[model samples]
Each structure stands twice: as C-alpha cells, then as structure tokens.
Target: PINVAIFGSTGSIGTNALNIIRECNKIENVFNVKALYVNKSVNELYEQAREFLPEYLCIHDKSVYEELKELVKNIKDYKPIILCGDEGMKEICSSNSIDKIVIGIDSFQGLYSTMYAIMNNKIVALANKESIVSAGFFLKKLLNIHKNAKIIPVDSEHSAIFQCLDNNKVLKTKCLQDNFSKINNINKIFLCSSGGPFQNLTMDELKNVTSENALKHPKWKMGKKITIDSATMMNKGLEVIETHFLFDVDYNDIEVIVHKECIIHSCVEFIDKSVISQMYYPDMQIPILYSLTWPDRIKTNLKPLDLAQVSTLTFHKPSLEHFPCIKLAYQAGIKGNFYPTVLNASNEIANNLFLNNKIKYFDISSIISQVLESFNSQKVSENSEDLMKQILQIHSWAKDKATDIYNKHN
Candidate 1:
C-alpha cells in the first residue's frame, strides 16, 4: 500500500494521478490517496475530497480556506483537515504522513514541496518542470545531503527515457544518489515534441494568435501555463534543461526533435549507434503508474496498444525562427547560474499575461528574453540555503521585470 499526496489536485496531472489511484484501488484500497492540494480551485478540491476522502487537503491560497471548508462541510461523516499556504504544504511534504508525493502544481511553488520532501527523505514524482528548471542547483545539493530522497520524472518524455535506462531496473531506491543517470555509452538523449498545435503555422501567421488558439494543444491536456508553453515550444526547451539536470547529460548531448505523433516519447542512443526507445499510446497514466510503483510495474486495466493499426510516424526539426521561446530556453539553460530561474519566472508571468489577453502571444518570449538578457550577474553563495535564497530572489526579480514589461506594453 502506498500513501500519496497530489500537490495540484484539481489540474490535469493531479486529476490523472487520482484516476490511477482509483483504478489501482479497484480491488483494494491499497493505494491511499492521502492528501490533496490546490492553489485556489476550491470547488474542484471539495469534489476531489468528497470522492477520495483524503486525510489532508492543502490550499496554496490562504484566503480560500474558509471557502473550501464551507464547500467540504457538506460531505457527511467525512471531512479532510483543511490547511493553508506554504507552512502547511511544508508540513505535508516533510512529515511521514504520505509516503509518495506527486509534485504536479503548475508553478514554481511546487519547488518548495519538492525541496522539503527531498530533505525529509520522501519519494517525489515530479511533473512540474518549472520547479526543476528553476531550482535544479539546490535540488541537486539537497539530494547530495539526503541520500534516501529521490525523484521520479512524471513527464511522458522523461518517463520514456527512464524506462530505457539501466537505473530503472537496477538502482535500489534508498540512499540512491543523483549520479544514478551514470551511463558510459549514451550518445544522445533525444527528447521528442509535437511542435505543439501551431507547428504548421508560419511566423507571420503566429503574430495574431490568441490564447484560445494556443491552448488547443494537439496531444496532451495540460494546465494553462504549460499549454501556453507548449504553443511557445518553451515547454520542450524546459524539458531539455530538465533532462540535463535529471539525467546528468550535457546540454550539447540533449537534442530536441519535432515528432508529430508524440508516440515514441523519448529515446537514448549509445556509442555503437544503437537506439533504444520506449513507445506507448499518447497517454500519461502509465508514466504516473511507473512513478508511483517504480522498479515494480503494476497491472492496470487501461487500454492496450495496437501497433498494427498505427499509421505512419514522421520526424522533423523544430523551427526556432517561428518559436523563439525554445531558442531562448536553450540559451538561458546553457548559460546556467540562475538563468533558468529568470527564464522560467518571466515566461510564467508572461504566460499569465497572455492568458488574460493582456499581451500578444509573441510577447511571451519577448518578455522572457528581455528579462533574461537584462540580468546583470549571479551571486556567490556559501551553502545550499544561500544558493536557494539567490534562486528565489532572482526568480522574484525576473517576475518584477516581466510584469514591468507587461505594464509598459499595455
């Protein structure tokens, strides 16, 4: 039996995770959906709590605590303990109440829970790439300090790479270190993308697209920010940085390709040029299941794949000309030293701006690139705490700059 807490309980990732729990619990309640958290989606949180009857429900927005309680109060004989904000989230992560955590919150806020969970030695299934992309330096430092703490990648591409890796089969979870991505023969880790919904649209045509057009992601159903990131191809770029951090692969060795089907997910090439790949129907559930029960694949009654019915799969190159966010992400990621934090912060707030129709679609990358380029330098830190503070400050600074740009644009 595994106890689980979903950080973004109302969003796509968390909802899918809960579905896995429900399916796995068909015969027995062995998979305990112990805790649920939401930023401000109180109604959906209440609905989830009523269904799962979780042990704890956390709200990132403190003002909505009473509102959440009011909604959940209607549930008879069962009420999840209501908690709010960062401290409550820290308690949920650090304490042993939940064995495994799904860090699916769509923002940088997910980083805090990820840090505490690692330091306290809890299993973390990370779907929020922003957290890793922004704060990977400190996350690496924390894993070095707490040997028992480890993270499982929940993104489909990273999940596929993990499956082809030897660590998936051999590594013992406890006391497992980050050098775990050790492979002497890796030629390249090819991260695939669909080029999002507007892959066919030209650069000139992209200038007038709205949030509605952008959010219609062709393959995956993600939250607001990620969907926008997908349209910008910044999502793929962020994945490149994430792959660099998680797999300890060099930025040069991580290649991004445009695979329209998104069927292959991700693959690795060895020195001898033999390519090992993992393929499944375009779905996220299996990956989540693997993260939940790693080194041990559990049986699920989900739809089976029929390769005979599959059509032709094609591959091409991502056009950074039209999608500058991907290029900007590559530059920021390679630059290192809190660059990814600024890129993520600016893009995040810019995504919000675009979603609210406050800015043009192209303004997302423009804001990110400007905020990123304007960053003067990095600070020298003595310890992990100092390093983390630097990251947070840089992230905040980037947000301010991005917001200022947005205000000026309007």
Candidate 2:
C-alpha cells in the first residue's frame, strides 16, 4: 500500500484525493492516509481526521490551533499528533510514513511545501501551477539530486501528457533537455483550453465583466483563483511554462488552442506526423487517480466518454488581444530567470484584487504586464542558495507594485 500525505486537505483536489483513497480502501486497500494538512479550515479538517484517522494532522493557521485542538478531543478513540504553522507543514512533508505527497494549496503558497517534499525525496503529486511556475528550475535541480523523488502532474493537461508518454522510452530517460531534441521523435505538444465562460465576449464585454460571470466556467468546476485565471487564459499560459519545465519542451513547440468540447484534455504530435490524444469526460478524479496510482490503472466507475453524442469538436486560436496574460506568461517563461516568479506573484495579487471587486477584470492582465515591463532588467542570482531569497524578494516586490498600480487607478 502507498502511504500519502495530503496538503490543503480542505480544498477540492484534497477532498477528491480522499474520496479516491476511501474508494480504493474499500476495494483493494491500496492506499493509506498518513497525514492531512490544511490552511485554516478547522471544521473540515476535524471531519476529515475523524473519517480517515491519519497519524499526523497539520494546520497552517496558528491562530486556530487551540480551537482545532479542542475539536480533536471530541473524537472517541483517535488521538492524532496535531501540529501548527509552517514548521508543522514541513514536518508533515518530511514524514517517513508518507510515500506520496499531494500538493493542492492555492497559488505560490505551495512552493515551500513542494520544496520540503522534494528535499525528503517523496513522490510529489503536484496540482499547484503557481508553485511550479515560480520554482520549476529549482525543483528540477532538486529532482536531479534526489533520484528517488518524482513529480507526477495532477493538472489535467500535464496528466494527459504524462499518460500519453507513459510507454515512450525516450521520455523515460529522465533527461528533460534531451526529450525535446530530434532524437526523441516528438514534434509538438498541444495544451487545450475550454476558452472559459467569457470566450464569446467581445473586448468591451470583457472590460465590464464581473467576477461572478468570469467564475461561471462552462466546462470544468475549479477553485475561484483558477477559474479567474482560466477566463484570462493566464492559466493556459502558466501551463505552457509548466509544460516547458515538466517535459523539458521548448516554448516554441508548446501550443495553446481553444477546444470548446473539453473532451480532448491534451494532445501530442510526433515526428512521424501521428498525433496522440488523451480524451475523457471532464473530471478531476481521472487525473487525480492516475497520479496516485501511476504506471498502473485501477478500476473506476467514472462515466465513459460517448463520442457519438458529442457530434462536433471544434478548435480555434487563442486571441492575444482578448487575453494578453497568455503572451505575458510566454515572455516571462522564455526570459528564464526570475521573470516567471514575478509574473506569477503579480498575477496572483491582481487576480485576487479583481476577484474582490477591487479592480476591473481587464486590470488583472494590465497589472501583470506593467509589473513584468518594470522588472525586465532585474536578474536573479545563479547561485541556488541565494536564488530562494531573490525569488522571495522579487515576489514581494511584484505584489506590492501590482497593488500600487491597482490603487492608483481605483
């Protein structure tokens, strides 16, 4: 059985992972819940602890530790070692009982936990795009040192690529740099987007669009932040950078297209001109399950895709004018130092500002664009030890700058 520790246990991805564990436990008993971590959802954390009865429980919010402690006492027989704050999170990540660590935390907050998991040489099932966006190169370097460690992508797009490349010998070599060359026989990778709820909206309509409207995703139900990122197409842009780091593919070879059907999760084209695509009904369970049980498929009751009922599938090019964040992501990704880190931080702050109605929908990309332009000259230290400090400094600077821009106009 594989022991797992779920970070962000209160979020959608965490809950789904638990559900999968529960189902698998009932059947084959393949997974064991070792620990659970959450930010501030004390009530939900308590309930999850009661059900799974993990050995370790961590709450990132120190202020709620006393209340959580009191709540845990009500459990009839289970007494878990409860921990609080960042140190508590690190402890959970480093636990020897955990064979796999599922990172579901929102935004860049998951970065440190990701690093902790890698440091401990744990298999990391990653869902947080911002973490990878901010520190992919650093994570890659760590993976090189810790040979036992591997990151299985939990995002639908990356998961699709992972599944498609499962049997390809070239990709199995563990060298990302070589995977992109002609020797790998891989031509192009296509990352598909649903075009979001506002896909049909004109540029003028986008300016007046509200948070509620943007959150009304037509295909997939995701977290508020990701939903907003999807509407802006920044999510796809971030995925491009992620794909670059995850697969060692060049930025030029990674293409983003609008697939309104959402049936084809992602596709890959080889040198022979044959295209391979992974298609399934839009569900997080499929990818999450695959991430948990990799190189092996488990029996699932998920609804099978009926291509006959889906009469038409159409694809379109993403508009740079409508969504400038996509362009900004590529620019930052190609620049290769701390630009992606700054882009992610600025975008996160701007996204939250728009979500809270502190800024217009259009202001999200505008703020990020301005921040990137301002920091183009700044270079991060090549030294890995000093790089962490540089990243944090740049991240803070970007957020503050973005906030200042938002406040000046509003």
Candidate 3:
C-alpha cells in the first residue's frame, strides 16, 4: 500500500484527490491514507479524517487545534493523532511514513512543506503553480542532488506536458527508484489556456465584471483564486512561467494558445516536427489520478471524450489587452532570480485584494505591473534552506510594496 499524505485536504485539489483515493481503495486497496492537512477548514478536515482514518490529521492554523480535536473526538473506535499548524505539516513531511504526498496547498506558503518533502525524497504531486514560481530557483538545484525526490505536477497544463514528454517513465515507479529524468529533444511546448471565464469579453466588459463573474469559469470547476486567474488569462501567464521551471524549457520556446475548448490540456512539439498532446474533459480528477498512480494506471469508469459530439475545437492568440499580466509574467520569468518571486508575491497580494472585493477586476494586472516595475533589480542561495529564506525575504519585500501600492491607489 502506498501511504499518501494530502497537504491542503480541504481545498478542491484535496477533495478531488480524496475521490481518487476512495476509488483506488475500492478497486485495489493500494493506497494507505497517512496524513491530511488543512489551512482553516476544521469541519471539512474532520469529514475527511472520519472517512480516510489517516494516522495524522494536521491543521495549518494552530488556533483551530482545540476545535479540530473536539470534532475528531466524537469518532469512536479510532482517533488519529491531531497535529497543528505549519509545524504539523513539517512533522508529516519529516516522518518516514508517507510514500506519496498530494500537495493541494497554493501560493508561496507551500514552499516550506514542498522543500521538506524534497529533503525527505518523497513523491510530491504538486497542484499549485505559485510555490514553484517563487522557489523554482532553489528547487531546480535541489532536484539535481536529491535525485530521488520526484515532483509529479498535478496542474492540468503541466500534467499534460509531463505525459507528452514521457508517457510514464518521467514519473513512474521506476523513475522513483532511479535518478530523476532530465528530458531532452523537446523543441517547443504549447501551453493551452481556456481563457478563463471572460475569454471573449472586451477590456471594457472586463472592467465591468465582478468576482462573481470571474468566478463563473466557463470550464473547469477550479478554486476561486485560479478561476480569477483564468478570467484574466493570468493563469496562462503563470503556467508559462511554471512550464519554464518544471520542464526546464526556455521562455522563448514556451508559447501560450487560447484554446477555449480546454479539451487539449497542453501539448509538446518535438524537433522532428511531431506534436503530442494530452486531451481530456476539463476535470482535475484525471490529472490527480495520473499523478497518484502513474506508469501503473488504474481501470476506472471516468467519462471518455466523444470528439464527434464536441463538433469542433478552436485555438487563437492571447491578447495583451485582455491579459496584460501575461506580458509582465513573461518579463519576470525571462529575467529570472528574485523577479519571478516578486511577480508571484505581488500578484498574490493583488489577487487576494481582488478576491476580497478590495480592488476592481482590472486593477489586478495593473497592480502586478506596477509591483514588477517597482523592483530596481536586486542582487541574488544554497543549502536549499538558506535559498528558501532568501527567496522568501524577496517575497516579503515585494508583498509589502504591493500592499503600499494598493494603499496609494485606494
């Protein structure tokens, strides 16, 4: 049985992953649920603990410890060890218990847990793009020496690119036992975008749209944060940056296509003029399942695609007018170093303001643009831990600046 730990077990990624675990257990009973962690969703976390009976239940917000413990106490015949806060997440990652870790946590916060998992050399199935954007500089170096540490990207785009890159060996059982893969021969990578909820809306219309409008993503039932990203096509921008780091591709070679259909999750163009694409209905479950049990695929009743019923798939170019953040993200990724960290940190702050109705829909891009511009370029880590500190320090600097800019405008 592969012991699996879920970092953000209350979020969409965690819920979807739990579904796969349930299905896999029913079919094969191969996954031994070990740990489940939540940011602040006590009730939701309790619900998962009741079913999975994981050995450890962790909460990121330690204040909820008593509340979570009270909720878990009701369950008779079993009581898993309840851990608290980031310390708890660290405990789970450090223990020699987990085989696979499904990291559903988003943003720069996922940095510590992910780095710890890498240190332990566990199979990390990552869902968020920001953590990588912030720490990819350190992570790339860690991946080299910690050759056993493997990252199976759980995002739809990166997963598609991973499948296209190496069917299974790139993230299979064999891959785990051996050194990590350094894939070669890739000419260009095509990162497809659903264009979020406002694919065709004019800039004028975009400004008029609210959080409710952006949250209503046409395809893919994603978390609100990512849904907002799609509405502005900034999700594609972030994906472009992640593609560069995760696949070791160059900024110039990564192209973003506005494929509203979303059937083609992502694709890779080989130098031999061959293009291999991974396609599926817009669902996180498919990719999560792939990441959980790669090389050895499980038989399931997942809905298969009927291309004829779909009629036609379309593709187009992303307009800077619609997603000005895309250009800023490209600039950040191209420059490399603390730049991407700043890009993610500032956007994270601005995106939260957008989420909370503290800022307008259109203000997000402009805010990030300004934040990126405010950086006059700073100097440039090692021991991975030290690298994390330095990167996080840069993040804090950008975050405060973003907040200052937001205040100035307000």
Candidate 4:
C-alpha cells in the first residue's frame, strides 16, 4: 500500500484526493492516508483527520492550533501527532513514512513544502502549478541532486502531457534535461482550455464583469482563486509556464488553445505530424487518481467517456484583447528570471482585490501588466540562495504595489 500525504486538505483538489483514498481503501487498501494538512479551516481539517486518522496532522496557521487540538480531542479512535506553523509542514514533507505527497496548496506557499518533499526524495503528485511556475529552475536543480525525486502532475493538462510523453517513451529518462531542442521527434505540446465563462464576451462586457459572474466557470469546478484565474485565462497562462518546467520544453513550443468542450485535456504533436491526446470528461478525480496510482491503473467508478456523444470537439485561439492576463503570463515566462514570480505575486494580489470588490475584473490583468513593466529591465539572481530570497522580496513588493495601484484606481 502507498502511504500519502494530502496538503491543503480543505481545498477542492485535496478533498477529491481524499475521496479517491477512501475508495482505494475499499479495494485492497492500495492507498494509506498517512498525513493531512490545512492552512486554516480547522473544522474541515478536524473532520478529515477524524475520518482518515492519519499519523500526522499539520495546521499552517499556528493561531488555530489550540482550537484544532480541542476539536481533535473527541477523535479518540486515533490520536495523530499534531503540528503547527511552517515547521510542521516542513516536518511532514520530510517524513520518511510519506510515500507520495499530493501538493494542493495554493500560490507560493506551496514552494517550501514542494522543496522539502523533493529533498526528502518523496514522490510528489503536484497540483500546485504556482510552485513550479515560480521555481522551475530550482526544482530542476533539486532533482539533479536527489535522483529519486519524482513529480507526477495532478493538473489535467500536465497529467495529459505526462501520460502522452510516458506512452511514447519520450519521458523515459528520470532527469528531464534543460535542453528541449535535444529531445528528438517532438514538435509541440497543445495545452487546452475551456475558454472560461468570458470566452464570448466582448472587451466592453468584461469591463463590467463581477466576481460572481467570473466564478461561474463553463467547465471544471475549482477553488475560488483558480476559478477567477480561469475566467481571466491566467490559469492557462500559468499552466503554460508550468508546462515548460514540467516537460522541459521551450516557451515557443508550448501552445495554449481554447477548446470549448474541455473534452481534450491536452495534446502533444510529433515531428512526423502525428498527435497524441488524452480525453476525459471535466473531472478532477481522473487526474488525481492517475497521480495516486502512477505506472498502474485502478478501477474507478467514474463514468467512461463516450466519443460519439461528445460529437465535434472544437478549438480556437485565445483572444489577448479580452484575456490580457494570458499574454502577460507568456511574456513573463519568456523573460524568465524573477518575472514569473512577480507575475504570479502581482496577479494573486490583484485577483484577491477583484474578488473583494476593491478592484474591477479587468484591473487584475492591468495591475499585473503594470508590475511586469515596472521590472522590465531588472536582472534576476542565478545563485540559488539569492534567487529564492529575491523571489520572496519581489513577491512582497509586487503585492504591495498591486494593492497600492488598486487603492489609487478605486
């Protein structure tokens, strides 16, 4: 049985992962839920801990630990070693008992846990794209040092790419080299999107769009932040940055297309003009199950896809006019350095501002563009220590600047 740690246990992906674990337990107990973590929401975490009864329980918010302890007092069946703060997360990530870590934490907060997991040589089923998008270079370096460090994508797009590359023997090598040009017979990768709710809305319509409207995504059900990112198409942009790091492909070769159906998760094209695609109904369970059972498949009760019913799968190019966040993301990714870090930081703050009604929906991309333009000529640090330090520094600076910009505009 594979022992697993579910980070961000209260979130959408984490909860779904728990459901899979619950199901797996019924059939031969393929997965053992070893640890569970949450940033806040002690009530949900408490419920999960009671059900899963993991060996370790980590709460990132130290302030809520006492309350969490009190809540878990009733869980007499199993008493887990309760931990709090960043240290708790670090300990869990480095724990030898954890066979696979499902990183579902949002934003840059995921970076630390991801690093610790890699350093400890744990298999990572990573759903946290921001971690890779912000620190792909560092992760690659870490993989070089720890040969056993493995990451299987939990995001539908990246998981699709991983499956395709694995099937074709393209990703047979443990260490994915920095040089994408050297990889033979691969042409390009197509990262598909559902075009979000605003796919057909005009520029004028987007200006007046509210958070509620944006949150109503056309396809997949996701967390609030990610749903907003989807509406802005920034999620797709972040996925592009993530695809580059995960597959070791050039930014130019990783393309994003608007597939309204959301049936084709992602695809890869070969030099011989052949394309391989992974298709499934818009469901997080598929990818989560895949990540949990890598190199093997488990019989799941999820509905099988019927191609005939799907009929025609259509695709189109994303409109930069309405979804400027996509363009800004591509620009930041191409620029490399700490630009992607700034992009993620600024957009996150801006997205939150929009969500709280402090800023207009369109202001999310505008503020991010302004921040990127402000740091256009800045040189990034190559030193590992300096790079991480500068990334946090820039992240803080960008958030403050974005907040200030929002205040000024409002």
lDDT of 3: 0.83
Worst 10 residues of 3 by lDDT: 173-182
Lowest lDDT sum, 10 consecutive residues, model 4, at 173-182
Q: Write the per-residue lDDT of candidate 1 for residues 51-150, one digit (tens) a residue.
A: 9998898998988998998898899998667889988898788667788999888789888888888988888998888988999878888888887787
* TM-score computed on alpha carbons, candidate 1: 0.94
Evaluate residue 160 in candidate 1 and report its C-alpha lDDT on the 0 to 100 scale: 86
Clashing pairs in 3: 196-230
Instruction: Compute the lDDT for candidate 4.
Output: 0.85
Q: What ranking emerges by TM-score with the best candidate at the front? A: 2, 4, 3, 1
Whole-model lDDT values for every prediction: 0.85, 0.86, 0.83, 0.85
Per-residue lDDT for 358 in model 3? 90
Superior by TM-score: candidate 1 or candidate 2: 2
Candidate 3 wrongly placed segments (more than 4 Å): 167-182
Candidate 4: regions farther than 4 A off: 167-176, 180-184, 376-383
Q: For residues 1-410, could you state the per-residue lDDT of candidate 3 as single tens digits?
A: 78899988888899999997887678777888899998999999998899989999998887888999999989999868799987788789988888889988877787778888987889899897888888776777777768788888898988888777665545433222222323445778889988887777887887877887878888888687877787777778888888887776778988999898889998888878799999999989889988888755787667789999988999998888778889988999998878899998998888888888899877898888888888876655557667777887889999999999999999
Tell me how far the alpha carbon of residue 140 in candidate 2 is from the true structure, in angstroms, after superposition.
1.5
